Amino acid sequence: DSRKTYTLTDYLKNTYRLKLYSLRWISDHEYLYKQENNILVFNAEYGNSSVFLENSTFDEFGHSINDYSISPDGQFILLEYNYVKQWRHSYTASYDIYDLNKRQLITEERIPNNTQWVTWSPVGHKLAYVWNNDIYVKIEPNLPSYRITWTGKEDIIYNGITDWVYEEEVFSAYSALWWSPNGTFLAYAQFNDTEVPLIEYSFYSDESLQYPKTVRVPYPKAGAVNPTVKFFVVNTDSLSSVTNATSIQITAPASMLIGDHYLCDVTWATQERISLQWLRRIQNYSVMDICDYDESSGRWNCLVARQHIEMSTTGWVGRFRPSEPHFTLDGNSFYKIISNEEGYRHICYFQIDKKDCTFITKGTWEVIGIEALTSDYLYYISNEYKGMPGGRNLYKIQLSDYTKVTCLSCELNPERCQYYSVSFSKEAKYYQLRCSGPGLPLYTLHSSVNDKGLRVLEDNSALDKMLQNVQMPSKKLDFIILNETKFWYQMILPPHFDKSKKYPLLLDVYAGPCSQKADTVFRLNWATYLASTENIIVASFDGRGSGYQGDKIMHAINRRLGTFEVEDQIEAARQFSKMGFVDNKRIAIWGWSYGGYVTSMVLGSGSGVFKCGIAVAPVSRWEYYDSVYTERYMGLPTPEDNLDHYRNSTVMSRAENFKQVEYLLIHGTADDNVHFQQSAQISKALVDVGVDFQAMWYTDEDHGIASSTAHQHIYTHMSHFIKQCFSLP
């Protein structure tokens, strides 16, 4: 075999690029696709298309357009530029509205610069945006905006947008506004961070900045003061009729008001019915209110007879939060993924005014998500196929006969495709399937009326050809039995894997709650190069605490992070040793964030199993991480609750054991998520016990250390360290 191998430069330069097929449904019949810098519109049924927007339309715009957004009625397009990223989802940008019909740009009553969020109404072309922490609404793109709130205050009062912790841990979005189905009402959340402590750190910026800037962010660490929240609904149809439309507040249940709580879900059911889910700071109790508009009082009332409670005795509620409801068209019933009596998450059917739901699916597997719902069918993704927790397939279940369940993707290409994600058209008339492994990604279009494949959108044939001239590694996905329980793992094996030989092994770990590192997804990453070029076996293992396998496994680390998930990774290392093809003298471990925490906990366990390890932006002490995430699994860091385990699960307390291993600690100085503070304390602890180790800080990089140059630099640095640790005499 004289073929080249997949090198580090290949990975860092992205020589072998996976092609994608990102489309945007604009209706139940067509979608927009960007090709040749121009926006094309495709007819799903026949595959024919037209030039929706010539790539030359805005050559003299004067700005590089970051993204586009077509109004629901296709009459206008929102141009986004001057994009400036903030956290994981938040960012600010400038916007110009283009009239597609008059093929002219709107220059009157423009959306202001430094806008925090903007979104079209579900129908028509109304606009709601947040600027300087206040909400504004534009009925017509060229007309003056109506101000909705006057409380907005930087880092203090957030209207229509989330604060740091709500963005990252609760809504996974910066937006905190929800239009009603036909756009009449605009609902929104308001966060008050007045007493939330601030994390502060330096930002050096370009060399030209003489004095470092101090970034300050309202961020509640474990047990600190959380932001408070309020919910409001305003009738946008009355804006042009009244000088100041009233925002009607919907107060949280008394069961929530008794203490700290969170607004965790907002979902409209009908034009005049909205559901809200609240969660107690002690995340094992959630309440869902279903509220109707009272046309006579202009108020929103939530009948207790329509209030649903969801709690957990073994852990927290939901995988990462209470699941969202999926309402029937009439809004009188909904479907929700919840853990059944066996601890497996399945779809339960609810009548809004009946507290007991009916499970429509069941078994020793789990529903991953509900993708679409029609009057006759509900489509969902699950890992039922072949009992593989790391596989994903699309299923269709007949609402009039639950025994009728069809897997729409399982047999499309069983050898190449075992992991799917889907994208349905507006009314689920068509759906695009996205296969992401174990083979190369395959994109296909299908018609729901007969479930027939319409055509292949992208099969990555080009890339496949290229990879032929390369000695690519292989992936082994299997399981090992521990205490009569099955635990999955995967190994990226180097080319020509020979079981009679001894290969050095690198344990790629994450292991956070409900995590999954053993799956059927195909990836071109650092591990690819390590296996391919350095002949290193890169393994990952899903032990206790991992998700998609039922609550018995997932809740195993409840109130006890830093234990079972850590111990199991070590045991997994021993197990792989027993397999016979591993050089026990060369076993390393590495991880990012939670993975860095587990890596450090393992390296400081004194097991003697690992020779070296690399921790990137690791958590080191739970009281340093945020409240929402941490408390969900750890409760409160108080004597009366769980302070003892909080203080017993730190990386610092194991400092002395690092004398037995080679350690590389890496962290970006501008990490707003896992603060540099966390690694700063690890290093100080190691220095205090006289432990030598390697370190690397990345100036102004955040938790992702993803800038082009930093990305190349960190993996290069880590490669040298791994090669050095495995180098033989």
Ligand X SMILES: *[C@@H]1O[C@H](CO[C@@H]2O[C@@H](C)[C@@H](O)[C@@H](O)[C@@H]2O)[C@@H](O)[C@H](O)[C@H]1NC(C)=O
Ligand Y SMILES: *[C@@H]1O[C@H](CO)[C@@H](O)[C@H](O)[C@H]1NC(C)=O
Ligand Z SMILES: *[C@@H]1O[C@H](CO)[C@@H](O[C@@H]2O[C@H](CO)[C@@H](O)[C@H](O)[C@H]2NC(C)=O)[C@H](O)[C@H]1NC(C)=O
User: Does the protein bind ligand Z through residue 192 (CB under 6 A)?
Assistant: yes
User: Does the protein bind ligand Z through residue 195 (CB under 6 A)?
Assistant: yes
CB nearer to ligand Y: pick between 127 and 570? 127
Pairing of strands 30-35, 38-43: antiparallel
User: Does the protein bind ligand X through residue 445 (CB under 6 A)?
Assistant: no
Helices (H), 539-696: 551-554, 564-578, 594-603, 627-634, 643-648, 676-688
CB nearer to ligand Y: pick between 281 and 621? 281
Under DSSP, the state recorded for 363 is S
Of ligand Y, ligand Z, a copy of itself, none, which one does residue 669 interact with (CB within 5 to 8 Å by kind)?
a copy of itself
- The single residue among 38, 82, 151, 660 that binds ligand Z, judged by CB under 6 A, is 151
Of ligand Y, a copy of itself, ligand X, none, which one does residue 695 interact with (CB within 5 to 8 Å by kind)?
a copy of itself
Of ligand Y, a copy of itself, ligand Z, none, which one does residue 112 interact with (CB within 5 to 8 Å by kind)?
ligand Y
CB nearer to a copy of itself: pick between 215 and 257? 215
> Residue 392: what residue type?
R
Of ligand Y, ligand X, a copy of itself, none, which one does residue 631 interact with (CB within 5 to 8 Å by kind)?
none
User: Does the protein bind ligand X through residue 46 (CB under 6 A)?
Assistant: yes
The residues carrying an active-site annotation are 593, 671, 703
Stretch 650-709 residues interacting with a copy of itself (CB under 8 A): 650, 652, 669, 675-677, 680-681, 683-685, 687-688, 690, 692, 694-700, 709
Of 422, 600, 445, 599, the C-alpha closest to 517 is 599
Under DSSP, the state recorded for 429 is S
Q: Pick the piece of the chain touching ligand X (CB under 6 A) from 44-52, 101-109, 340-348, 694-702.
A: 44-52
Query: 276 and 263 in contact (C-beta within 8 Å)?
Result: yes
Structure token digits, residue 73: 């009625």
Question: Strand 23-25's sheet: what is its strand order?
Answer: 23-25, 30-35, 38-43, 49-53
CA distances from 302 to 153, 253, 349 (A): 30, 9, 20
CB nearer to ligand Y: pick between 245 and 378? 245
CB of 303 to ligand Y, least distance (A): 23
Query: 23 and 42 in contact (C-beta within 8 Å)?
Result: yes
CA–CA separation, 156 and 716 (whole Å): 41
Q: With the CA atoms of 21, 123, 145 and 228 taken in that order, what torsion angle do they form, in degrees rounded to the nearest 10? A: -80
Q: Which residues bind ligand Y (CB under 6 A)?
A: 94, 110, 112-113, 150, 243-244, 282, 284-285, 311-313, 635
User: Does the protein bind ligand Z through residue 583 (CB under 6 A)?
Assistant: no
CB of 253 to ligand Y, least distance (A): 15
CB nearer to ligand Y: pick between 336 and 654? 336
CB of 123 to a copy of itself, least distance (A): 46
CA distances from 615 to 65, 175, 306 (A): 37, 33, 48
Stretch 214-273 residues interacting with ligand Z (CB under 6 A): 235, 237, 244, 271-272
User: Does the protein bind a copy of itself through residue 107 (CB under 8 A)?
Assistant: no
**DSSP β-bridge partners for residue 105:** 98
CB of 184 to ligand Z, least distance (A): 4
Of ligand X, ligand Y, a copy of itself, none, which one does residue 84 interact with (CB within 5 to 8 Å by kind)?
none
CA–CA separation, 489 and 474 (whole Å): 14
- The single residue among 15, 43, 194, 716 that binds ligand Z, judged by CB under 6 A, is 194
Within 8 A by CB and 6+ apart from 43, the residues are: 29, 30, 49
CB of 297 to ligand Y, least distance (A): 22
Write the burial class of residue 337 (CB in 10 Å: 0-12 exposed, 13-18 middle, 19+ buried): buried
Pairing of strands 503-508, 537-541: parallel
Q: Pick the piece of the chain touching ligand Z (CB under 6 A) from 150-158, 162-170, 522-530, 569-577.
A: 150-158
- The single residue among 37, 50, 107, 400 that binds ligand X, judged by CB under 6 A, is 50
Stretch 195-234 residues interacting with a copy of itself (CB under 8 A): 197-202, 204, 207, 210-212, 214, 221-222, 224
Strand ranges for 483-545 from DSSP E: 485-493, 503-508, 537-541
Stretch 346-405 residues interacting with ligand Z (CB under 6 A): none
CB of 255 to ligand Y, least distance (A): 11
Q: Pick the piece of the chain touching ligand X (CB under 6 A) from 38-46, 227-235, 283-291, 502-510.
A: 38-46
Q: Pick the piece of the chain touching a copy of itself (CB under 8 A) from 42-50, 193-201, 264-272, 371-379.
A: 193-201
CB of 685 to a copy of itself, least distance (A): 7
CB of 422 to ligand X, least distance (A): 22
CB of 366 to ligand Y, least distance (A): 21
Structure token digits, residue 152: 């907005």
Stretch 568-627 residues interacting with a copy of itself (CB under 8 A): 621, 623-624
Under DSSP, the state recorded for 227 is P
CA–CA separation, 134 and 154 (whole Å): 10
User: Does the protein bind ligand X through residue 101 (CB under 6 A)?
Assistant: no
Work out the angle at residue 318's Cα, subtended by the Cα atoms of residues 316 and 321, and round it to the nearest 5 degrees.
90
DSSP letter for each residue of 249-317: E-PPPHHHHTS-EEEEEEEEEETTEEEEEEEESSSSEEEEEEEEEETTTTEEEE-GGG-EEEE-SSS-S
Of 670, 685, 668, 691, the C-alpha closest to 618 is 668
Query: 377 and 397 in contact (C-beta within 8 Å)?
Result: yes
Q: How many residues bind a copy of itself (CB under 8 A)?
A: 47
CA–CA separation, 301 and 509 (whole Å): 48
CA–CA separation, 422 and 430 (whole Å): 10
Of ligand X, ligand Z, ligand Y, none, which one does residue 195 interact with (CB within 5 to 8 Å by kind)?
ligand Z
CA–CA separation, 227 and 149 (whole Å): 18
CA–CA separation, 456 and 432 (whole Å): 10
CB of 148 to ligand Y, least distance (A): 10
> Count of CB atoms within 10 A of residue 636's CB?
18
CB nearer to ligand Z: pick between 228 and 681? 228
Q: How many residues bind ligand Z (CB under 6 A)?
A: 14
Of a copy of itself, ligand Y, ligand X, none, which one does residue 211 interact with (CB within 5 to 8 Å by kind)?
a copy of itself
- The single residue among 295, 356, 401, 484 that binds ligand Z, judged by CB under 6 A, is 295
Q: Pick the piece of the chain touching ligand X (CB under 6 A) from 42-50, 328-336, 614-622, 687-695.
A: 42-50
CB of 449 to ligand X, least distance (A): 16
CB nearer to ligand Y: pick between 208 and 313? 313
CA distances from 438 to 420, 480, 678 (A): 10, 20, 36
Q: Which residues bind a copy of itself (CB under 8 A)?
A: 197-202, 204, 207, 210-212, 214, 221-222, 224, 621, 623-624, 650, 652, 669, 675-677, 680-681, 683-685, 687-688, 690, 692, 694-700, 709-710, 712-713, 716-717, 720
Binding site for ligand Z (CB under 6 A): 150-151, 157, 182, 184, 192, 194-195, 235, 237, 244, 271-272, 295
